[PDB]
Amino acid sequence: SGFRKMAFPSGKVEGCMVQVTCGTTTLNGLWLDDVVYCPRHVICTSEDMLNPNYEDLLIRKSNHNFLVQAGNVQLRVIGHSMQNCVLKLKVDTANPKTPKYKFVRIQPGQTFSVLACYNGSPSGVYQCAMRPNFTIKGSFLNGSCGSVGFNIDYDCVSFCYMHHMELPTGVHAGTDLEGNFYGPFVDRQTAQAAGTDTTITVNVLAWLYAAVINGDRWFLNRFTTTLNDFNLVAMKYNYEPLTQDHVDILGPLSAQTGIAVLDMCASLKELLQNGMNGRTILGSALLEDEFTPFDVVRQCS
Amino acid sequence: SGFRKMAFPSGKVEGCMVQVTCGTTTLNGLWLDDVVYCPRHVICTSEDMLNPNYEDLLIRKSNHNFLVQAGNVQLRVIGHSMQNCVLKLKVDTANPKTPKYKFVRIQPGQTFSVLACYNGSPSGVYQCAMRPNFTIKGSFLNGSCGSVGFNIDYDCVSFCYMHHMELPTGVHAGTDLEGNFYGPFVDRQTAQAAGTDTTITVNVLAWLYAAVINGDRWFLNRFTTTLNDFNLVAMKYNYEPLTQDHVDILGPLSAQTGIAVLDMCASLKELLQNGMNGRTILGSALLEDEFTPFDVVRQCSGVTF
Numbered sequence: 191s192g193f194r195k196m197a198f199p200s201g202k203v204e205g206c207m208v209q210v211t212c213g214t215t216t217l218n219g220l221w222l223d224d225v226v227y228c229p230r231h232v233i234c235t236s237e238d239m240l241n242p243n244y245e246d247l248l249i250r251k252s253n254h255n256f257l258v259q260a261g262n263v264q265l266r267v268i269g270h271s272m273q274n275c276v277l278k279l280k281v282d283t284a285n286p287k288t289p290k291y292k293f294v295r296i297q298p299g300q301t302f303s304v305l306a307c308y309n310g311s312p313s314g315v316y317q318c319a320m321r322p323n324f325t326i327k328g329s330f331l332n333g334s335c336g337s338v339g340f341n342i343d344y345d346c347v348s349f350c351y352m353h354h355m356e357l358p359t360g361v362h363a364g365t366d367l368e369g370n371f372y373g374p375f376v377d378r379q380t381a382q383a384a385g386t387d388t389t390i391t392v393n394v395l396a397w398l399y400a401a402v403i404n405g406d407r408w409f410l411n412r413f414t415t416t417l418n419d420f421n422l423v424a425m426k427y428n429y430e431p432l433t434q435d436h437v438d439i440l441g442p443l444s445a446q447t448g449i450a451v452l453d454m455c456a457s458l459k460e461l462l463q464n465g466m467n468g469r470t471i472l473g474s475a476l477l478e479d480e481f482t483p484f485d486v487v488r489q490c491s
Numbered sequence: 492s493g494f495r496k497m498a499f500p501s502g503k504v505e506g507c508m509v510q511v512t513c514g515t516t517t518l519n520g521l522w523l524d525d526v527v528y529c530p531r532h533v534i535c536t537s538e539d540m541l542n543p544n545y546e547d548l549l550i551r552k553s554n555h556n557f558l559v560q561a562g563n564v565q566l567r568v569i570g571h572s573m574q575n576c577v578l579k580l581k582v583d584t585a586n587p588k589t590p591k592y593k594f595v596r597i598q599p600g601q602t603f604s605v606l607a608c609y610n611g612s613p614s615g616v617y618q619c620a621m622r623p624n625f626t627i628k629g630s631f632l633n634g635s636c637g638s639v640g641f642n643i644d645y646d647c648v649s650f651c652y653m654h655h656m657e658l659p660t661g662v663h664a665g666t667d668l669e670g671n672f673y674g675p676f677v678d679r680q681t682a683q684a685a686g687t688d689t690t691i692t693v694n695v696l697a698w699l700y701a702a703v704i705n706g707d708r709w710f711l712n713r714f715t716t717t718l719n720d721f722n723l724v725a726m727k728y729n730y731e732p733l734t735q736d737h738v739d740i741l742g743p744l745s746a747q748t749g750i751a752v753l754d755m756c757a758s759l760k761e762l763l764q765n766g767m768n769g770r771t772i773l774g775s776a777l778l779e780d781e782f783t784p785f786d787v788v789r790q791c792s793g794v795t796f
């Protein structure tokens with residue numbers, strides 16, 4: 191019993207983190223096989239960051255200008271190449287600790303573990319969700335760039351996120367491992383603002399299922415509702431529309447608890463209209479939306 | 492910026508987790524050097540567990556009856572031993588992945604990372620606190636016994652917790668690595684009273700400093716208070732009394748934010764008397780006591796291991 195925000199064990203990713211230094215810029219790189227992946231803004235200087243032309247900088251650089259260090263050992267850089275907002279440094283030695291891995295692009299709502307890193311060393315691990323507005327509410331300081339987010343299935347590490355920047359808002363923007371930004375952000379020191387965020391409805395519901403499993407049942411009510419009636423209420427309270435895909439995804443949890451999805455949706459509606467009343471669910475006085483249906487099942491299995 | 496419940500990187504510990512099997516019972520063990528540590532209830536049967544005579548049960552066992560599987564290879568057991576509520580299996584081979592490590596007994600109020608494991612394989616990691624009443628509020632299922640809690644300082648892993656049981660209440664109890672229970676608990680399948688819990692006051696204050704550091708300042712007040720006055724409020728709301736030691740531990744955070752401890756205490760008092768008021772502090776509608784002053788600095792300093 192119990193429910194906690196739980197990250198994947200970070201051992202496999204730890205063995206891939208390196209430090210990448212170019213001129214005076216240092217950040218974190220991800221060393222898989224014979225390739226080192228990192229944010230392209232490592233090739234920049236301060237002055238360039240307000241209006242950088244990355245095409246020119248990469249040609250003005252050579253293999254030897256890139257210092258790659260795995261722990262205390264220097265990797266030798268064979269070649270360098272740019273893909274979107276990520277630089278790929280070919281190195282002379284394959285990473286002996288390289289796990290089975292995939293690169294994946296996650297959708298808003300999906301969760302992952304972040305291993306926050308400085309100078310190629312790990313500081314800590316926490317769990318995050320990709321918000322609908324395509325930001326993440328992380329914990330990152332100067333030098334955290336190149337830190338990565340991931341999921342682990344058995345032995346396979348699916349990398350989904352590399353950290354690039356903090357917005358003036360204090361939220362966090364970054365790319366997939368192909369170097370494409372999540373959301374509309376760019377790697378410049380410009381205005382760029384994140385859109386108004388929304389609550390991930392399917393996740394909240396999963397959380398309510400998790401509460402029921404753990405003996406929190408007070409919010410359960412005798413009402414039922416319809417997907418349409420419920421979406422009307424979701425819209426009012428800035429909640430993502432619930433789809434039939436969502437309802438299907440909640441089937442296993444519905445089955446386990448014997449509470450039909452639309453009945454749980456009626457509980458939720460009531461919680462949105464009446465609030466918490468000063469009660470708590472699973473130790474929280476707010477509705478939590480950073481656990482997927484998969485996370486709730488995983489955690490109960 | 493931002494502030495999250497951050498666990499330590501769990502690599503060093505992952506390589507120490509093994510499966511221990513004895514008869515039909517399987518659980519997790521911790522393999523350091525040439526010794527494997529697990530809960531002694533590994534020797535028990537579901538019958539025995541209401542009133543186990545551990546000495547007698549252990550006698551019926553020989554070290555050949557203890558199967559330790561690291562990943563997929565079996566280790567050979569030379570000698571077995573019971574220490575308090577832990578069993579120490581002497582094994583053939585020193586663990587090649589043994590980190591620099593210590594065994595420590597943490598205090599109520601201190602935090603640690605838990606690596607939840609099943610069948611000697613790690614499932615996830617989360618940060619929690621040793622409650623004043625010596626319980627933890629974890630996430631643990633059948634098979635999670637022998638999962639460990641730890642802190643890391645640079646290269647050194649300080650093991651402080653091994654998981655033994657879920658109480659009927661649904662909270663978790665366990666031992667240090669010498670097998671001594673935190674709290675009044677025993678490894679028997681009996682209902683057992685956890686005492687009344689308290690909020691860890693020093694930690695809430697540390698969290699308030701963390702909030703100010705991240706731009707959440709709304710709770711900051713024009714008032715101030717006294718240690719005694721504040722402590723009368725603390726006792727009303729089942730908060731731990733604040734001592735001068737706690738004030739001193741908060742000194743660095745006080746200096747960074749330029750906000751005196753007793754001023755922050757006045758803030759806290761007001762939050763206790765008037766509530767949150769539908770607002771949030773660092774994304775929570777409750778006062779969080781699961782961050783020490785050392786954890787706040789760690790996260791805001793960005794220390795690595």
Ligand SMILES: O=C1C[C@@H](C(=O)N2CCN(Cc3ccccc3)[C@H](c3ccccc3)C2)c2ccccc21
Nearest residue numbers: 215231234235236330331332355356377378379492
């Ligand atoms: O989460 C973090 C990441 C980090 C951070 O935001 N940095 C780091 C530096 N870079 C600039 C740079 C590149 C080369 C040389 C000199 C400066 C990033 C950047 C990337 C793209 C557009 C604008 C800025 C911005 C940061 C700083 C303070 C607080 C929290 C966070």
Ligand SMILES: O=C1C[C@@H](C(=O)N2CCN(Cc3ccccc3)[C@H](c3ccccc3)C2)c2ccccc21
Nearest residue numbers: 191516532535536537631632633656657678679680
């Ligand atoms: O967090 C968990 C840990 C786990 C759990 O509680 N177990 C596991 C078995 N053991 C007994 C056993 C030993 C050998 C053979 C048969 C039974 C523990 C125990 C230890 C000491 C006193 C009483 C019970 C109790 C558990 C089960 C369901 C839900 C959540 C949790």
